Symmetry: C2
Subunit: 398 residues, 2 copies
């Protein structure tokens, strides 16, 4: 019982120095490797032009970390030559400061049509088969259609085909984000006390993430007590902690854009027999999902392995409650959620380097939920946890 409650705030703060032995940032050669990979997958799908919008995919291919806006900022990759970077002219200086890939800047002034620029660049290289970023706003399709009459493919297969398998450098940045958030999770359980507010934990978790050297504090944070733990993504309203209540904390940060995403569920005080049984079951379901992971295995097979555990114990089947109402997991990288998804119907075979979450949450309607979440990556022979799973309902940390 040494992990829950024993700690005061500035006592926690003494363990919040900036992270050391930081992982190296992605280098210029790796960006080029990603471009070349995209080109292979473009050729495979019969595509000769690829438009990537501002967001995690632009960051992946070029280093530009900006969120998307109403203004088109995009990378147009074609079969050869430096890719074109379409960008508002007033942003050129900011752009140069973040670009990690050599490009050919095509700048547009505010009243000019940036979609016209994209097609002009396509015509220059005689590209006539575009694949468009599935994350880009629909407005961009509308813009391109005024100028482009040929088929516009969904670039999802190409983008996933690149991003799903992580390089050692990517794994190391993810590892760093995970090690940090694990510590934040540990300290959050430490300072928990009777009456503490959910808002207080959220705020501490953000503070901790910042102190440890995350990109931007907490990426997200879900904290729920007692019966509120039955809602997987939570509900509005501040709670205050009472003995006997489960505490669910799902949170993460980013390091150079790469996400951690960890959930811990633990008891504050004495657990009921119901809470203990469901907690142990959650641990076993997560364990089973992990044990099913090796190269070649269909993603849905991992989801099924977790459900098989629940069913054997009289929960489920399928998504029936009490049981697991959502997928077992999601891929994770530069985005909090990305391919491959650990979900029924997904026949995608797992390959070394693939990163996904393992979080087969059990919901007991009207009562509580137990969610344990740690991420893994696929190895040559099996899997490797980014963070080791919890041990007991009152021992969230291995």
């Amino acid at each position: 019982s040494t992990q829950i409650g024993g700690m005061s705030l500035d006592q926690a703060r003494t363990q919040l120095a900036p992270w050391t032995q930081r992982a190296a940032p992605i280098g210029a050669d790796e960006y080029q490797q990603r471009i070349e990979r995209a080109r292979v997958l473009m050729r495979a799908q019969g595509v000769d032009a690829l438009l990537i919008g501002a967001g995690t995919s632009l960051r992946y291919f070029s280093g530009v970390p900006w969120g998307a806006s109403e203004r088109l900022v995009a990378l147009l990759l074609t079969t050869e030559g430096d890719p074109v970077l379409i960008c508002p002219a007033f942003e050129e200086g900011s752009l140069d400061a973040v670009l990690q890939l050599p490009v050919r800047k095509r700048l547009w002034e505010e009243h000019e049509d940036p979609y016209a620029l994209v097609v002009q660049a396509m015509d220059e290289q005689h590209a006539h088969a575009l694949a468009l970023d599935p994350g880009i706003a629909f407005a961009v399709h509308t813009g391109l259609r005024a100028h482009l009459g040929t088929a516009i493919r969904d670039a999802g297969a190409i983008i996933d085909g690149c991003r799903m398998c992580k390089s050692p450098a990517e794994l190391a940045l993810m590892q760093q984000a995970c090690d940090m958030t694990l510590l934040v999770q540990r300290l959050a359980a430490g300072i928990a006390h009777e009456g503490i507010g959910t808002d207080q934990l959220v705020r501490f978790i953000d503070e901790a993430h910042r102190a440890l050297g995350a990109d931007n504090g907490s990426t997200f944070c879900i904290v729920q007590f007692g019966h509120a733990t039955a809602f997987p993504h939570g509900i509005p309203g501040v709670q205050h902690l009472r003995a006997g209540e489960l505490v669910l904390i799902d949170t993460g940060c980013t390091v150079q854009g790469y996400h951690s995403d960890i959930t811990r569920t633990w008891i504050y005080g004495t657990p009921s027999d119901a809470q203990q049984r469901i907690w142990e079951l959650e641990l076993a379901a997560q364990a089973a999902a992990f044990a099913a992971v090796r190269p070649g295995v269909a993603c849905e097979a991992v989801d099924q392995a977790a459900r098989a555990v629940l069913q054997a114990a009289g929960l489920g089947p399928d998504y029936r409650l009490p049981g697991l109402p959502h997928r077992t997991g999601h891929g994770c990288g530069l985005a909090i959620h990305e391919a491959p998804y650990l979900v029924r119907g997904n026949r995608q075979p797992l390959q070394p380097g693939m990163c996904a979450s393992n979080e087969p949450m059990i919901v007991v309607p009207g009562a509580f939920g137990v969610a344990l979440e740690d991420h893994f990556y696929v190895t040559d022979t099996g899997a490797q946890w980014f963070t080791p799973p919890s041990v007991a309902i009152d021992q969230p940390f291995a």
Copy 2:
């Protein structure tokens, strides 16, 4: 006096939660918004409207969630309660935030939610879908998978609703702006030699929270000295020096409605160039405002700011020193929305429309001066949400 002189503790004495808070949007108003979209659909020959999670779903239904890879959407047709497409597992969380009566169509994880959209269309003999232009392109792919018919862009329908704000919408934006204006005042107040950009950003977030914003600072740009020449700034912490301009662009939300205010002021003594360019910026912003009245095109407001700059020998067009980007953007449940105060936009301003007025001057290699205050259009002219600055060393009226 407005710049410096205030300690952090004295600043915090002014940070009680906001009082005289504006009312949240009522059930009746969400229904009015739906009815407006319906006539806009009819005006356009559209009989189905799909709205994705985001500021537009919040606008029509009250649901505030960010978009995800899982479709969460509102399908509006010509009659009946609109359909809400949503993951089955989210139904509980959904019920806690929905402000509109809907017909739920829930999908399990392995099921095709786009199939549910098209089934709902088929049941109502709808064949003319307009799609939310803010939605992920993956949704277009998913719907096209099931539709051989045209999929139109829903921009005109959505803007046709959102551009003109109701009195309740104005009051929520007004509160957010009043809050952020005070945060701007306190930020200028605690300024001192050596203070970091990172420290100002943290205080401004802390302040927005204490005041009762939705989620601290929505965003925050703080630049010093030469760094003020970059409209959206650049990486790196700075520490304040005498003789440097400070630019602060920040905002919060209240019930989702945005503030968005920029102040640029001198710490210490300004140079002649800084003073002249500061004055010119106030004048450009003033002229843009004076141009606003019903019927005036958005581009004419942008042109009024540019004409001031060109008269003074800056520009023309976007040439620097001058104004490298548009004069402003609409603002509401989104930080950026229609109508845009930009060349080429012939959209006439009408009463209720809300927009920023921020004709920033950039002086390459030297500095930039940005003043930003938002306004709404009235029957005869315009009304500031916040009053413009007075001088380079008096950021607040």
